[PDB]
Chains A and B, each alone.
Chain A
Amino acid sequence: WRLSGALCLQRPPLITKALTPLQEEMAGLLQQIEVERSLYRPGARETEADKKNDRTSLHRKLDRNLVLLVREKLGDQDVWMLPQVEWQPGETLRGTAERILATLSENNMEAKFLGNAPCGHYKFKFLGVKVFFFKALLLTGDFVQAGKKSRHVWASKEELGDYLQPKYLAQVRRFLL
C-alpha cells in the first residue's frame, strides 16, 4: 500500500469588517465613561494591491482566511492536490504534518499542532492509496520563496471546488471553515 500524508493548512483572517456607524457613537459614549471609571513601519491592510495575480504568494488575501493548495505529481498521476507528501508508519501524523510544512513549502511559517487526531481521509483507487488531511492553526505566516515554479495556491474554499473536483478531494470543505 502507498502511504501518503497531506496537510490542510489554515490561514487566519487578519482584519474583520468595519463596525457600523451606529456602533461608533455608542463606542464614543462608552469611551468617555471609560476614562472616568478607569482604574489606575506597519504593513498595508491589504498587501495584494501591487500583486493582483500572486496566487503563489502566501498573502493572496488578508481580509479572509486561506488554505494552501499545491499542484503535486505522483508516479502515475499529475493532478492539483492539497499539500501532499509520502509518510511512514513510524512517523506520527503531527510528525508527518510537520514534515509537510517544511518539505513542500520550505519556509519558516509559524504553525502549532495541538491535536494529533486527523480530520479527513479519502482514498483514490484505480493500487490502493489513501490521503491524510490534517488541520492546524496559523498565528502568522512567513512564506519564503513566494514565486516558486510550483503552482502552490492559498485558497480556503472558493478555489477548493474549482481545483479539487472529485468528492474524495472536494469534500475537504466538510471540516473547513
Chain B
Amino acid sequence: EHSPEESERRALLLKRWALFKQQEHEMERDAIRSMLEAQQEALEELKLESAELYAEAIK
C-alpha cells in the first residue's frame, strides 16, 4: 500500500503532467488556427495575382 508521502509525491507529478499537457493542448489548438489562418491567408494572396491559377489548385 502506498504511503501518504508516496501519494503526495504522486499527486504532485500528476499536477505537473496535467500542466504540461494542457499547455501542449493550448499550443496545439493555436497551431491549428495559425496554420489554417496562414493557409487561408495564403489562399487570398495568389487570388489577387491570378485567380485562374487556383482553378487547377482547388481541384
Which residues of chain A have a CB within 8 Å of any CB of chain B? 1, 3, 20, 22, 89-93, 116-123, 128, 130, 132-133, 174-175, 177
Contacts and interface: CB of A to CB of B under 8 A. Distances in A.
B52 interface: yes
B34 interface: yes
Given A22-B13, A120-B38, A174-B34, A90 B46 contact: no
A121 B42 contact: yes
Contacts of A20: 13
29 contacts: A1-B49, A3-B53, A20-B13, A89-B52, A89-B53, A89-B56, A92-B56, A92-B57, A93-B56, A93-B57, A116-B57, A116-B58, A117-B42, A117-B57, A118-B39, A118-B42, A118-B46, A120-B39, A120-B42, A121-B46, A123-B45, A128-B49, A130-B45, A130-B46, A132-B46, A175-B35, A175-B38, A175-B39, A177-B31
B59 interface: yes
Given A20-B13, A177-B31, 8 more contacts: A90-B56, A92-B56, A116-B57, A117-B43, A118-B42, A121-B46, A130-B45, A175-B39
Q: Which of A20, A22, A128, A177 has the most CB of B within 10 A?
A: A22
A134 to B, nearest CB: 10
B31 to A, nearest CB: 7
B25 interface: no
B20 to A, nearest CB: 11
Contacts of A117: 39, 42-43, 57
B10 interface: yes
